[PDB]
Every structure is written in structure tokens, then in C-alpha cells.
Amino acid sequence: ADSDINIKTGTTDIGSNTTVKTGDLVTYDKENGMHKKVFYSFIDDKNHNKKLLVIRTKGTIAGQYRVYSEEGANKSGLAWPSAFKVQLQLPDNEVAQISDYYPRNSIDTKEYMSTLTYGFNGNVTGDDTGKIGGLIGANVSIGHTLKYVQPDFKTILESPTDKKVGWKVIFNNMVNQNWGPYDRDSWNPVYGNQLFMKTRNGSMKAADNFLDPNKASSLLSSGFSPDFATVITMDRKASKQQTNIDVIYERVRDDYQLHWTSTNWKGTNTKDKWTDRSSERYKIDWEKEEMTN
Amino acid sequence: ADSDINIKTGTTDIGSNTTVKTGDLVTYDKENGMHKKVFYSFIDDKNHNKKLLVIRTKGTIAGQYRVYSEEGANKSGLAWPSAFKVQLQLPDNEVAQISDYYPRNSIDTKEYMSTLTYGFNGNVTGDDTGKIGGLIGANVSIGHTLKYVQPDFKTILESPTDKKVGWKVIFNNMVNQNWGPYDRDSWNPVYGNQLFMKTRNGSMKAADNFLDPNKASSLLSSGFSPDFATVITMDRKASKQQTNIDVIYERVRDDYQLHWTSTNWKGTNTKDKWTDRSSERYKIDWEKEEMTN
Amino acid sequence: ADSDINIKTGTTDIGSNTTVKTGDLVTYDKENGMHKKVFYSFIDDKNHNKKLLVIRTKGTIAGQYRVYSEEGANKSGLAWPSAFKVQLQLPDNEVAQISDYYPRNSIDTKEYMSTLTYGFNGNVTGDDTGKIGGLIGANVSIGHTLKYVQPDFKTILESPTDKKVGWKVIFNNMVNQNWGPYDRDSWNPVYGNQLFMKTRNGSMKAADNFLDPNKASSLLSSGFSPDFATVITMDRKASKQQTNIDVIYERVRDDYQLHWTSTNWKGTNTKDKWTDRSSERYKIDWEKEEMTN
Amino acid sequence: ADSDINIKTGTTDIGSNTTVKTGDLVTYDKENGMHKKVFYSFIDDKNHNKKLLVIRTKGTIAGQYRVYSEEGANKSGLAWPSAFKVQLQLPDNEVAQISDYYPRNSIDTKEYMSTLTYGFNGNVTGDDTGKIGGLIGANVSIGHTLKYVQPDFKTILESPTDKKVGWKVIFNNMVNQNWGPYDRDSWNPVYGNQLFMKTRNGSMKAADNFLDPNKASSLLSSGFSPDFATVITMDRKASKQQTNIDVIYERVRDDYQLHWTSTNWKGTNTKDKWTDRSSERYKIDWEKEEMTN
Amino acid sequence: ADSDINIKTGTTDIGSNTTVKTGDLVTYDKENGMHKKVFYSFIDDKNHNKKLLVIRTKGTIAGQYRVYSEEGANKSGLAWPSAFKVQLQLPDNEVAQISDYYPRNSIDTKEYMSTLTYGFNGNVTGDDTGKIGGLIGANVSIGHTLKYVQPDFKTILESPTDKKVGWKVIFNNMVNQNWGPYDRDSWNPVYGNQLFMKTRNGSMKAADNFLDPNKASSLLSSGFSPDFATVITMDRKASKQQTNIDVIYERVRDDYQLHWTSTNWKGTNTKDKWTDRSSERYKIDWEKEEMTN
Ligand SMILES: CCCCCCCC/C=C\CCCCCCCC(=O)O[C@@H](COC(=O)CCCCCCCCCCCCCCC)COP(=O)([O-])OCC[N+](C)(C)C
Ligand SMILES: CCCCCCCC/C=C\CCCCCCCC(=O)O[C@@H](COC(=O)CCCCCCCCCCCCCCC)COP(=O)([O-])OCC[N+](C)(C)C
Ligand SMILES: CCCCCCCC/C=C\CCCCCCCC(=O)O[C@@H](COC(=O)CCCCCCCCCCCCCCC)COP(=O)([O-])OCC[N+](C)(C)C
Ligand SMILES: CCCCCCCC/C=C\CCCCCCCC(=O)O[C@@H](COC(=O)CCCCCCCCCCCCCCC)COP(=O)([O-])OCC[N+](C)(C)C
Numbered sequence A, B, C, D, E: 001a002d003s004d005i006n007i008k009t010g011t012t013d014i015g016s017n018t019t020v021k022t023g024d025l026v027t028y029d030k031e032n033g034m035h036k037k038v039f040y041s042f043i044d045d046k047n048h049n050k051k052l053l054v055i056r057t058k059g060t061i062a063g064q065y066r067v068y069s070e071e072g073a074n075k076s077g078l079a080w081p082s083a084f085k086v087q088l089q090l091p092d093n094e095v096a097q098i099s100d101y102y103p104r105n106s107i108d109t110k111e112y113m114s115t116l117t118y119g120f121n122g123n124v125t126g127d128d129t130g131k132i133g134g135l136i137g138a139n140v141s142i143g144h145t146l147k148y149v150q151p152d153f154k155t156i157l158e159s160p161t162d163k164k165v166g167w168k169v170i171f172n173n174m175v176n177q178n179w180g181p182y183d184r185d186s187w188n189p190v191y192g193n194q195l196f197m198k199t200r201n202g203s204m205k206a207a208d209n210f211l212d213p214n215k216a217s218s219l220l221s222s223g224f225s226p227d228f229a230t231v232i233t234m235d236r237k238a239s240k241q242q243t244n245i246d247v248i249y250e251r252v253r254d255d256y257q258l259h260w261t262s263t264n265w266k267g268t269n270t271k272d273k274w275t276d277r278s279s280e281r282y283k284i285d286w287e288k289e290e291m292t293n
């Protein structure tokens, strides 16, 4: 906090008394259904040291959650997005550099609780025949309790090198039919991986026996809208004022297959089955303060 | 709070009615993968007593979480970052001084709860043969409950001397596979240190039997992005207006080795195995209000 | 709240339409490792009655947590900071006076909860031979639950007299290895004071058997950064416009010794073993609105 | 809330477009250790109807927590502050009046919870000899739970008459050694009042066997800093423009004595033992807008 | 929320670009100890339709909690305030009207929770003689939990007619000596109403055996400070510009009597015993924008 140093709040910020020429570019890849978008802003403050440029790759990525193949009632498949990714890269011989990026890895906290209990007991037993009995007892108990919050999808920031920076979204785990949370590597010897399982021993058709997309998480079927911000700085005395950028919106799917062995349904997961990449190259003109492509 | 003294809020702050010449420097160490960055700001308020300069060493440090060595299925190793560090130092004969630093040690709180319970009981027992029995009893219980929040990574501020100040990030403990939180010194006589253990008695290959990086904390594999702020003040009447600074982004790793003894997997940890340091020297020109290197 | 009286917020504050000449002084005591700092601000509002001056003794104090003496494996010592202190004093014959101070003693609250429970029970017992039995019973229970938050270090404000004001930080208690919170006066007949105890009956060397500094609280090893604010007012018609101030950053340590009696480790604490004081005298010139020393 | 009536926020406030001549007075009573302070502010808005004056009696009161008398090991005494008080009074024949006061009595809330439980049970018992037995039972339970927050010190506002207004701080109850909260009237037939008791049956000296001041609440030993605000209004056409005020900072202590009867320590409390009052008379000049004394 | 309609926040408010002539009136009724106060404000916005006037009857009402009569040790009485009231009324033939009032009745919410539990059990019993026994059982449980917050004093708004509007404060219930909350109609066949009962079977004098005022709620003994706001609007073309207002601060007490029957103390409550009213008539001059009386 800039105010915790006695520095007046906002003194160290940049962007005062300057005109920023923003813009927008929208392009849709019908083949992959990735409504990618970039929102940039040229900031050139005379009090600064280098020209600035912030790229907000808002865009949007489809879910692609459907049964790709069905083979009778014996077995059927299913493809779902395991992880979403978006990254920005620059030419190796280029002069511009990546400075900052808002969504970054953050430390996680977990609660903890220890319980210690003492106890005592004593009773008198008697009956019609006049027998009298006694009982004295005691007990101790110790208990450790740990709780934490684990989101279904956990955003991560891949190691940002100078020339390229890339984010990532993965599938931590999901809760199905109010049962214990499952994940890709969850296994059960009898049923197997029950992540996307409708009924344990249903008699319906193989393809029909799948978890409803509405019940599952919104990202899987309805897509995930990203919001990542990066800032690019380039020296104001550079001989060449043209820069090239590349934007990637790759998405990784998985294969989920149900198998009827003799009585119950069995499920198996094949992580990293298909990968779809949609890369477009943009051009930057620092002199004209415009990104067009 | 400046407002709790009846002083109008922000009156004691510095930076009003002045022009601040900010800047930026970005350099990447491919050898160590440390995308270090410094964001400075020259504040020279005539109402102040000394020139000011705030260095925000945002930067970023890679994770370097991989199996460095594998030796068949008998055993395999693993290297992970135990602690991240970043510090700023000045020449001993220099005249500038360190004034403040935002992230600082903070007191920690823990809950507490004491429980006391009384009880009474009485029942009548009878059967077909007409036997009637009685029972009177009582019990007491006392319970102490203590809970607190312990983050996986706990930031610390090393003893800040005048010439140098240094922060630190360490590995408090981690939760594995929803089991009890482990740490570097955790030991189990049968299995041993089970921090990064995939399966207790899995039959897979030695190298494969490791916790997935996605399951583990984000910092270990995807790196840690620091945000530390320091302010440097130098007298306005100093004969020499040039100052030299040094920035360090050292990172410490550890060695984790799994051993198959006869049936189960055994794990051992060797703290402070390797250390990587990447120091760069910057130059400060108070007269020109610019940091270049 | 000034707004709860219908007075417009901030009307009663002081510091409007005036120029404040702030400053800074930094000095480091290598002998004691106390990076003391003072940040002042001269406020002289014509609408006010007396000149004002606020001293923010931010500074910083080292931890000094190390094993001072080791004597073989039989026993070893340990010195840790029991309490931190910082206070401001004025000459007895001086004319300036202490007005206010932000961090002040605050009331503490504790939860409370009373539970009352009734119960009834009735069962029928029968067997193969046709015997039928009955049982009717009842029970009552009363329970008192009390929980509160107790920080490890509890800041206190010593009785502020006109000429001097002094704060204080003490060691309330600590939680070790997720066990019951201990404190200086905690005693156990078998083991003794187990505050800084690594293992109850470890076979390692005497000096090695100590709690890791990382596990313990951050203040003990990495130091404590204070932030206390005071305001000094002096009459504007005083004949002499020069004032002298004294700043103290005294820190108190303790001695902790482990003793191996026959099988287990025994620990004893000797409170108030050593005291370190580092006092520097500053000079105030109200006429020139500057503090220099 | 002025905004809940559709009136623009702050429209009804007073203090706009006016100059307020604030001030300060500091005086210390070494005899009683009461660093009393008054911070006033003259508000005279032409749009208003009467002149205004707000007195903020911040000040500070010492704790005075020490063993006043010790008589061997048989018994010893102890004096602690039972209640703090501060009030403002005006001459009976005066014309000024008390209008408002910020800290005022507030309603208190308490939680509540009712629990109802049904239960059923049935088991089959069998042994090697083939005997088969059954058991069917049921139970009901009702539970009332009530919890609330009770601070150690509870501020109160004495009945404010026109000429004088007075606040009050009392000792609600305290928690000792993590045991049940005690208070002045708490009594135990065996031990007695165990409020400030160190050990139930300790063998140390009578004077030494007292609760450490650090463990007890901060107010008792380190003093209590008050913050009460009052506003005084006087007609602008009054013939006499001079007004006299009186400020009181009375503090009430108590006597606590431990008695060793035969084996254990016994404690008794004598409420309202001593009272200390420190009254100073200030003078107000509405015409000159200044309070001096 | 005016901003939820897309209307810019504060557009519909009234009071912009206008001068408000506020005021104040203070009068104390020594007979009843009711430090009544009214704070008004004349708002006349040309963009408005009618003249406005807001009356904030802050004032303050004493508690009057004392033992009115004592008759030996056999029995004694006690008078406490059951309910506080404040209302504003206008002449029937008057033309002004009541528009709004801030403190208004609000809906109350209560939590709810349903619990369902299944259970199974099975054990094997064996002894030295080789007898082996078994036991299999199961159980079910259902539980409804409801909790809510009930303040001791619950403010209410009486049916506001055009000519008069009146608020009300009543005594919902109180918690005594950490026991179940009692109220006026609470009855116990053995002891009776135990609201203000010190000891169930104490041997002290009848008058002394009362709950300490400090333990009870602050309002009962130390008084209640009200804060109610009303706005009065009168047409700008009215022939007569003078209006009369009446302010009432009536307070209702109760009689509480303890009776020693043979062994224990018995308590009875007589609701609505005495009523005190203190009405003063104010005069309003819209033309001069002043309220004087
Ligand atoms: C290693 C040594 C061996 C163990 C020694 C003793 C244990 C076994 C004894 C033997 C079993 C006998 C049981 C009797 C009572 C048990 C509680 C007790 O002993 O003290 C308790 C005090 O906690 C309290 O607050 C007191 C409990 C009742 C309070 C009643 C107050 C007034 C009574 C009138 C009521 C009406 C009015 C109510 C108020 C208005 C707890 O203390 P402790 O138990 O000594 O705790 C240390 C020991 N331990 C950790 C191992 C458990
Ligand atoms: C050291 C001295 C020895 C112990 C003495 C006594 C204990 C053993 C006795 C012997 C065992 C006999 C058990 C009988 C009852 C037990 C509760 C009791 O005694 O009083 C309880 C009062 O708490 C209440 O609120 C009353 C409980 C029922 C309320 C019913 C209200 C109206 C009844 C109609 C219902 C329908 C309508 C319901 C309402 C609309 C608790 O008080 P205590 O228990 O005296 O607590 C101090 C003692 N102790 C700390 C050691 C526990
Ligand atoms: C000092 C006097 C002696 C004690 C007198 C009685 C106790 C011992 C009796 C004897 C033991 C016999 C036990 C029978 C029931 C116990 C509960 C009971 O009595 O009333 C309870 C009412 O609470 C309820 O809400 C009712 C409980 C069941 C509700 C069923 C609703 C419809 C039934 C169809 C279900 C299907 C559909 C469900 C709905 C859709 C509680 O009231 P109480 O218990 O009278 O409380 C005062 C007494 N006490 C404080 C001392 C405990
Ligand atoms: C005054 C009248 C006398 C009392 C009448 C009955 C009580 C004693 C009877 C006699 C004792 C016999 C016990 C049998 C069951 C007890 C529960 C029951 O009766 O109904 C419960 C329904 O609550 C539920 O939700 C149903 C419980 C099981 C659900 C199973 C679903 C599918 C089964 C397949 C499982 C696998 C798959 C699971 C799902 C995927 C509760 O209703 P109630 O108990 O009627 O409540 C009113 C009565 N009472 C208030 C007095 C309690």
C-alpha cells in the first residue's frame, strides 16, 4: 500500500495528465469457437521512462462438452475441456519486453483446530431384590480438524519469461450428485472413475448415461470467459517502432468412456486426448499508437 | 490513523504539488529464470527534508519443480523450491540510507474456547417377570479448543539494517491428498516424510510416483511473484549525487528422494541442497532523477 | 464520530489551508541492531492555539534469537526477546507537552454461550425365548462455552505522563507444534516449561534440540517493526523556541535453558535476564520548523 | 440517515463555509496521574441559531494497580481501579446549555437457538449358542442455546441533565487463567472471590500470590484513555459572553485482600474503598472564541 | 437504490444549490428528568413543490430505576421503565402535513436448518471361555434448528397518521445472571417472575435483594437517548405562515415487588403502573424560517 509509507496515495501511479488512445479488436474462430478479443491502451507519460501498452485478452472460449462417439449400449465416449490456456508471445529478436501481469499466483491458507476433552462418569444401579451396584469411569479425547476451500477450476500463471507470458486454467475437482468430490485421477476398484457418471447401475442406454451438463460446472459446457491483463514496454529511442505480437487461446480436452462390464457401469479417463490451438499475429505501431490486424 | 489525532486525513503525507519522474527496468536471467523487475519513482518535495526514492521489486521467480535424477524403479529424486528471497543492498561507504518498507512482520492471533458440561441420567428397567430396576448417574466434561490459520508460505522480513534490507518467503507446511498437513521436518517411522508422496505402496515406477504439480501449491511449480516496496532517502546537500544499488533474487531449493525399502515407499528430505543467486548492480543519479542499468 | 453530532465531517479537524514542513531522520545502532527512525511533521495552523508536531517513531528492532551458550550435550541455553519497548521523554524543565498518541489501550470482548438440553429414551428388548423387557430413561445437560482471541504479542500503552509517553510490547503466549499454548510462567512437573522445546525426549545434542525459528513467531527471530505516533504542542509565545527530545528503543530478552535430568528434556525460563537500551537525543527548532540530530 | 429521506446527504449538517478556531489545553495532575486534556472548537455558522462549542475530553487516566499493603505471608492487600469516570458541569446560574454527546447508551442483542431431535434404533443380538435377541428404541431431545458478547469494561452514559453531563466506565467481568469469568460479586464458599488469584493453593508469599498485571486487562494496570465529545450552545444575544466550565476525572478503586485460612488461599473484595477526584475549572470567552485556563 | 434504475446517483435528491437555516432548542424538565432537544432545518428548494422542515428529536430520557418503597425484610418494591415513547402532533385544523420519518418498521429474518442422519453398527464379543457373540444395529435421526437475534429493547413505529407520528421503545426481554432470558409475562410456579431477582433464596434484606443496575441493561438505569427524524411540508401559497407543533416524551414505568413466602423469594410484576408525560408546544414561522419556543 503506497499509503503505508506516508506517501500520498496515488503519487507513484502513472497515467496522470496524459491522453490514452485505446482501441479494440474482435475476431471469431468458427472452427474452434474461440471468441477471442484484445483491448489495448497506449500510455505514454512524459514523466515516465518507457512507452507503455496494456493488453487485456478478455475474449471467450467455448466448452465443447458432448458425446463424441457412441457404440450401442455397450459403451460410449465423452469429450470435455480439461484445461483452458491463453498466452502472449513476442519475436525472439524483438526489442519490446513484458513488464507486469495482474492475475498472479497467490498464497493459500487453511484453517486448523485441535480439541482436547476430559470426562468423568459415575452411576448407581439397584433393583427390586435390593442389589446395589456402582460404576466409576473416565475418558479422554483428542481431535484435529482441518478445513480449506478448493475451487473447481484453479487459475495458474505459468513461468513468465521476458518474451512470453502465459496463464492457465485447470480442473481441480468436481462434486457430483452431492457425493464426494472427484477428479481426473480418482479411481474406484469396483466402479472406477465416477466423475461424469449419471447412475451407478442404470439400465438406460450407454450414451444417455451421462451427467447432465446443467448439473456440472458452468465452464465445462457453457465455456470460460478469461480476463488477463499484461503490460508491454518499449524504449522510446528504439530505431524500429514496429512490433509484432502473437496471441494463443489453446484449449485442452479429455476423453471419458463408460464401460458396462457385467452389472455396473465403469468409467475411465484418458487425460490430454486432443488439443486445439488458434494463434493470430497482431502488429503494433508505437509511432502511430495503434494495434491493427 | 492520522485521523484519530484530529489531524485532517492526509495532512502528514508527502508528495503533494510535486512532479514525480517514474521509470522501469526489466531484465531476464535465462540461466535462473528470474524475470526480475524494478519500478522506481523519484519524489523530491520542497517541503520535505531529504530526497526520496521508492523501489518496487515486483519481478518474478520461477518454480523449478522437476525430477532432477531418476535411477530405475529402485529410487528417484526431486528438487523443489524451499524458500524464495529478495533483498536490496548498498555500498558500505555510500551515503544513502534505507527508510521504510511496506511488507513487514505482523502479529498473529489464535482463537480459544473452553467448554464445561454437566449431565444427569436416570432410567427404570423392567421385564416380563416383573423385575424392576433403577439407575442414576451423572457426568462432567471439560474441553479446550484452539484454532488458527497457517498459510502454506509465510512471508518474513529479515532484520533490516541501514545499508541493506531483505525479505524472505519460506515453506510453512502443505496439505497432501486431503491428509494431515506435512512439512520439511515431518517424519513417520514406517513411511517417513510423506510430503510429496503420490501413493503409500504404489507399484508404479519410482520416478512416476510423485505428487502431481497441479495438486501441489501454485508457487512450487508455477513460480512466485513478489511485491516488495522500499524507500531510499539521500541528503540534498551531498557532494556526490551518484549512488549504486544491488538487487538479489536468490532462491533456495531442496532434494526429495523416495526409497523403496521392501514393500512401501520411503521418503527423505535434505533441506538446503542448492542455492541460486542472480545479483545485478543498478546505478542511481539523483541529479538527473533516473535509474539506468 | 464528528458526523454523529450533525457537525459536517472533518469540520473540527486541523491542518486545512496550511503548509506542513515534514522531514526524516534515520540512524542505525550496529551494536544493538535497532534501525530506529523518526518521521516528523510541523503543523502550525493560524486557526489553532498552539504549534503542533507529530513524531512517528516507525524504526525497527531486531529479534536476537540465538543459542548464546552451549555446554556439551548435557545442557544448553537460549536467548529470545521477551518484550519490545519504545518511549519518548522530554527535559523536566522544558515547556513543551505531550498531547495525544494514536495506539492506545482498547477494551477486549469475549463471547459466551449457555446450553441446556433435555432428553428421553425408551426401548423394548426381546429374545428368542420370548422374554420381553422395557426401559424408560431421561437426562439433562447444562453447558457453558467461552471463547476469545488472544494474540501472541499484545501491545500496551504505559501510563502517559505529560513529559514522557511510552509504549510496550510483551509476549502473551505461543502455540508450539500445534499443542496447547504456553507462556513464560507455564510449568509442567515432569518436563517443565515446554515453550521452546523441539522434542520431549529426543536423543540429539542439547544445543540442536530447540524449536526452529521459522516455526516460532516472526517477531522473535526476524524482529518487530513498530509504528507509534505522538503529537507535541508548544505555546507560540514561548521565550525559547528550542526543545530537546529523547528517544529510547529498549528491548528486553530472556534466558531459556534445557536440562536433561535422566531421560527427558527439562526446560526452565529466567525472565528479564538482559536489557539493551539505545537512547539518542534530538533537537527541535520551532522557529525554523526543523528537527536535526 | 439523512439520505433515507431523499434529502441530499450532508444538507442538514452545520459547519459549511465557516472558519473554526480550534485549540488545545494540556495539564497533568502528578498527585493522581491523570493526564487530562481538552480539545475544543468554536463553530459559529451564520445560518445557525446559536453559537456552538465542542469539547473533546480525550485526556488519559492511570491504572494504579499495585499491592498497597503486605503483612507477612499470612495476608496481603491489593488496590485496582473498579471504574473510571469523567463528567462536565456548568454553574447553576449560567446560561449555556449542553446539547449533544457522541458516546451514548446503545441497545444490546443476544443470539438464540432452539434444537429438536428425534431418534430411532434397532439391533439384533446373536451368539454362538444360537440365541437371537432384538431391541427397538427411540429418543427425543430439546435444546435452547443462548450466546452474547460481554466486554470486560462497559461504557455507560449517566443521566445527562442540562447543566452537567457525565460518562462512566465500569468493570463488567474478567477471565482469569482461561477459567470462568469472574466479577466483583462472584463468590465461592471454599476459595471465595477468585478474581485476582494467582494459585489456588500456592505456597509462595502472600504478596507474591497475585495475578500478573500483564495477564489481566490492559486498562487495570496501564490506564484507560477516554474519548468523549460534548457540544455546548449559548445564545448569540446573551448579555454576558463569559462562561465557566468544570471538568472532573474522578477514578474509583477497590480493595482486594487474600487470606490463607488453613490450606488454601481465600480472597475477599471491598468495593468502593477509595475515590480520587481531580477537578479543574476552565473559562470560556465566546466573544474572543478562546478557552484559556 | 436510485442507481439501479440507471439514474445517476443523487439526481432525485433535494437540497442542492440552496441555503438551509438550521437551529436548535434545548429544554430540561427537572420534574421528569427528560433532557429533550429538537434540531430542525428549513429546506426550501425552488425546484421543489412544497417547503420542507425536518425535526430531529434527539433529546434524552432518564432511566428512573430505584426501589420506590421498602417494607422491612418481608417485602420491597422496585420501579423500572417498561417502555419509552416520543411522538409529534399537530393541531387538527392546521394545514401542515407529515411526509416521512427515517426509523421505520423493518422485516425480521430467522435462520433454519434441517438435519438427517443414518447410522450402522456391528461388533463381535468374545471371552476367555470362547463364547462368540455378534450385534448388528442401525439408527436414524432428524433435527430442526432455528436461531434468531432478539434485542432487549425493540424500537417500533406507531401507526403514523397525517397530523401526528409517534415512535415507541419497549422491553422485549432480558438475560439475568447468564440464565434463560425472562420478560414481563414470564412466570414460574415456584419462584415466579425472576426478571429482577438477585438470589433465589438469599437471606439478605428484602430491599437489598435486587439485581445490580450495572448488570442490567444500560437503558433501564442510565436512560435512553432517542434519535428520530421527521419531515414536515407545508404549501408555499398558504394564507397563514405560522404553524404550531407539540412534542411529547412520555415514559412508562412498572412495579416489581419481591415476596418472601416461606423459604424462597417470589417476584410479581404489575405492568403499566405509572406514566409520566412532558409535552411542550413549539411555534413555527415559515416566512422567517425559524422555530422558537
Ligand atoms: C493427575 C492428577 C489426577 C487427577 C486429579 C483430578 C481429576 C480426577 C478427580 C476425581 C474425580 C472427581 C470429580 C469431581 C469434580 C471434577 C472436577 C475437578 O476435579 O476439578 C475441575 C474444576 O472445574 C471446576 O470448575 C469445578 C467443577 C465443579 C464446579 C462446582 C462449583 C461449586 C459447586 C456447587 C455446584 C452448584 C453451584 C454451581 C456454581 C454456581 C477440573 O480440575 P481437575 O479435574 O483437577 O483438572 C486437573 C486434573 N486432570 C487434568 C487430570 C483432569
Ligand atoms: C454441590 C451440590 C450438589 C449438587 C446440587 C444439584 C445437582 C444435582 C441434583 C440432583 C439431580 C436432580 C435433577 C433435577 C433437576 C436438575 C437441575 C437442577 O438441579 O437445577 C438446574 C436449574 O436449571 C434449570 O433451569 C432448571 C431445570 C429444569 C427447569 C424446569 C422448569 C419448570 C419445570 C416444569 C417443566 C415443564 C415446563 C418447562 C418450562 C416452561 C441447575 O442447577 P444445579 O443443578 O443446582 O446447579 C448447581 C449444582 N451443580 C453445579 C453441582 C450441578
Ligand atoms: C415437571 C413436569 C413433568 C414433565 C412433563 C413432561 C416431560 C416428560 C413427559 C413424559 C415423556 C413422554 C414423551 C412424549 C413426548 C415428549 C415431548 C413433550 O412432552 O412435549 C414437548 C413438546 O414438543 C413438541 O413440539 C412435541 C413433541 C412431538 C411433536 C409431534 C407433533 C405431531 C405428532 C405426530 C408426529 C408426526 C408428524 C410430525 C409433525 C408434522 C416438550 O414439552 P414438555 O416435555 O412438556 O416440556 C416441559 C416439561 N419439561 C421441561 C420438564 C421437559
Ligand atoms: C404419532 C405417529 C407415530 C410416529 C409415526 C412414525 C414414527 C415412528 C415410526 C416407526 C419407526 C420406523 C422407522 C422407519 C423410517 C423412519 C422415518 C419415517 O418414518 O419417515 C421419515 C421420513 O424421512 C425421510 O426422508 C424418509 C427416511 C428414509 C428415506 C429413504 C428414501 C428411499 C429409501 C431407500 C434408501 C436408499 C436410497 C436413499 C435415497 C437415494 C420421517 O417422518 P416421520 O418419522 O413419519 O415423522 C413424523 C412422526 N414423528 C414426528 C412422530 C417422528
Ligand SMILES: CCCCCCCC/C=C\CCCCCCCC(=O)O[C@@H](COC(=O)CCCCCCCCCCCCCCC)COP(=O)([O-])OCC[N+](C)(C)C
Binding pocket: E118, E120
Ligand atoms: C431401502 C434399502 C435398504 C438399505 C440399503 C443399504 C443400507 C443398509 C445396508 C447394509 C449395511 C452394510 C454397510 C456397508 C456399507 C454401508 C454404506 C452403503 O451401503 O453405501 C453407502 C455409500 O457411501 C459410500 O461412500 C460408501 C461407503 C464406504 C466407502 C468405501 C470406499 C472404498 C472402500 C475401501 C475403503 C478404504 C479406502 C477408502 C477410500 C480411499 C451409502 O449408500 P446406501 O447406504 O445404499 O444409502 C441408501 C440406503 N439407505 C438410505 C437406506 C441407507
